[PDB]
Design an enzyme around this catalytic site. Structure first.
Site, PDB file in Angstrom:
ATOM      1  N   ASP A   8       0.852  -1.195   0.000  1.00 20.35           N
ATOM      2  CA  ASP A   8       0.000   0.000   0.000  1.00 20.35           C
ATOM      3  C   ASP A   8       0.889   1.247   0.000  1.00 20.35           C
ATOM      4  O   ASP A   8       1.739   1.362   0.860  1.00 20.35           O
ATOM      5  CB  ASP A   8      -0.890  -0.039   1.262  1.00 20.35           C
ATOM      6  N   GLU A 107      -2.821  -0.143  -3.857  1.00 20.59           N
ATOM      7  CA  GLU A 107      -2.691  -1.333  -2.994  1.00 20.59           C
ATOM      8  C   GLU A 107      -2.827  -2.468  -3.915  1.00 20.59           C
ATOM      9  O   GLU A 107      -3.595  -2.382  -4.887  1.00 20.59           O
ATOM     10  CB  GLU A 107      -3.760  -1.531  -1.863  1.00 20.59           C
TER      11      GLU A 107
HETATM   12 CA    CA Z   1      -4.638   1.877   0.265  1.00 26.75          CA
END
Ligand code: CA
EC number: 2.7.7.7
Length: 342
Positions: A8, A107
Site C-alpha cells: 500500500d 494497494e
Molecule cells: Ca490503500
DNA sequence: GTCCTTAGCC
DNA sequence: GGCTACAG
C-alpha cells in the site's frame, strides 16, 4: 501454508506531489478535488502524515481543512499523474509474482506461496519490494504479510507508513480476540456504528451473537464474511480484478432542473467515459444525477448490443428526461456510467 | 441477467 | 468530490 504479501503506497497522491515538488519537503500537504463552483468548494482526497496529525483527512470539505490548517500547501488533484506512477509500480510489483490483485490505485495483493518457504523469506521479499520501489520511483510503501488477503491488509495498517509487518497464524488469534472491529478491511464508519450500538466491539463478539440479528442488519454478505474472519476461516484467493463499469461525473455551475442547460455537462461526462473505455464497448448506460440536497438518482438502460458513442448521446437525454420527471429536486451533478462490456 | 438505491476508498 | 463495487 499460503502466504499473501500486500502493498500500500503511503499517502499516495500527496507523496507523488512531494517527489515532484522538492519545495514541499517537511511541511503539510493536502491534495483536493476543487468543485469549480465557489471559493474552495470541494473535498480532500488525501493528506500527508504531517497534515493528518491535525485532523485534515480524506473526505472532509476543503473549507473545513482550511479551518484547521489555513496554510498547509493546497493542491489540485492531478489524477493522471498518480495514475502513471501507480501503473509503473504495479508493473514492478508484477515481476515478483504473477498472482496479483490490484485493488485500487494504491494497494495490491501478491500471492507468494510458490516463491518463498516461510514468513522469514517473505519479509525479506517484502524488503526487496519496498526498496526497489523507492529506488525507481522515490515512493515509500508499506508491506503487509499474512496467511490471507484480509490479514495482509491489516498487517500493513499497523506498520503504515514506510515499513513492514508480518502477522503469523498465532497473532491472527490475538487480533480475532482483541483488535478493534472498525479496523477490519471493508469496515469503516457506517458499519462500526451499525454494531457500536449492538455490543460488538471486536470480531469475536460476532460469534457471541445470533446469526439473523446480524444478517438482517449489516446484511447477509457482510455478516457471513466477518463470521468467517472470527472463525479464522477466510481463504479468499488472489484474483485479477476486472473493471465492471467506467464512468464520469461532473458538478455544474448553477444547479438547476432545465434539460437544455443540463444537456452539455451530460455530454462531456460521455466523451470522457469514452476516452476511458479504451476500445471497450459497454451494453449498458446509467445517467446519474446528484440533486440539490445531494440524494443521488439513477436511470439506466441495457441493450442487447453494444452502445455507440452517439447512441450514448441520445439515449442519455431520455434517461435524463425520466429523472427530471420522477424526482422533483434540482440537479447539481450530472454523469454517466457504462457497464457490461462486450 | 435488470431497474435501483447504499457504504468503503483515494 | 469523484470513483467503483456491493446489496439485496
Ligand atoms: Ca490503500
Amino acid at each position: 501454508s499460503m502466504i499473501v504479501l500486500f502493498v500500500d503506497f503511503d499517502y499516495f497522491y500527496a507523496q507523488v506531489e512531494e517527489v515532484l515538488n522538492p519545495s514541499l519537503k517537511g511541511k503539510p500537504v493536502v491534495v483536493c478535488v476543487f468543485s469549480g463552483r465557489f471559493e474552495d468548494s470541494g473535498a480532500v482526497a488525501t493528506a500527508n502524515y504531517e497534515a493528518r496529525k491535525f485532523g485534515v483527512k480524506a473526505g472532509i470539505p476543503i473549507v473545513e481543512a482550511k479551518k484547521i490548517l489555513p496554510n498547509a500547501v493546497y493542491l489540485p488533484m492531478r489524477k493522471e499523474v498518480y495514475q502513471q506512477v501507480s501503473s509503473r509500480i504495479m508493473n514492478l510489483l508484477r515481476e515478483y509474482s504473477e498472482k496479483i490483485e490490484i485493488a485500487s490505485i494504491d494497494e495490491a495483493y501478491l500471492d507468494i506461496s510458490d516463491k518463498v518457504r516461510d514468513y522469514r523469506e517473505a519479509y525479506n521479499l517484502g524488503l526487496e519490494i519496498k526498496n526497489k520501489i523507492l529506488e525507481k520511483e522515490k515512493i515509500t510503501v508499506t508491506v503487509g504479510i499474512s496467511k490471507n488477503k484480509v490479514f495482509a491488509k491489516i498487517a500493513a495498517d499497523m506498520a503504515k507508513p514506510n515499513g513492514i509487518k508480518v502477522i503469523d497464524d498465532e497473532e491472527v488469534k490475538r487480533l480475532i480476540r482483541e483488535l478493534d472491529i472498525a479496523d477490519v478491511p471493508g469496515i469503516g464508519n457506517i458499519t462500526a456504528e451499525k454494531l457500536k450500538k449492538l455490543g460488538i466491539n471486536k470480531l469475536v463478539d460476532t460469534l457471541s451473537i445470533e446469526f439473523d440479528k446480524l444478517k438482517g442488519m449489516i446484511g447477509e454478505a457482510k455478516a457471513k464474511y466477518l463470521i468467517s474472519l472470527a472463525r479464522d476461516e477466510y481463504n479468499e484467493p488472489i484474483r485479477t480484478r476486472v473493471r465492471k463499469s467506467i464512468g464520469r461525473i461532473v458538478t455544474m455551475k448553477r444547479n438547476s432542473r432545465n434539460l437544455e442547460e443540463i444537456k452539455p455537462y451530460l455530454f462531456r461526462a460521455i466523451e470522457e467515459s469514452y476516452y476511458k473505455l479504451d476500445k471497450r464497448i459497454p451494453k449498458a448506460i446509467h445517467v446519474v444525477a446528484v440533486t440539490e440536497d445531494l440524494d443521488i438518482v439513477s436511470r439506466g438502460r441495457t441493450f442487447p448490443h453494444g452502445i455507440s458513442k452517439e447512441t450514448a448521446y441520445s439515449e442519455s437525454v431520455k434517461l435524463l428526461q425520466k429523472i427530471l420527471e420522477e424526482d422533483e429536486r434540482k440537479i447539481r451533478r450530472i454523469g454517466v456510467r457504462f457497464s457490461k462490456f462486450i
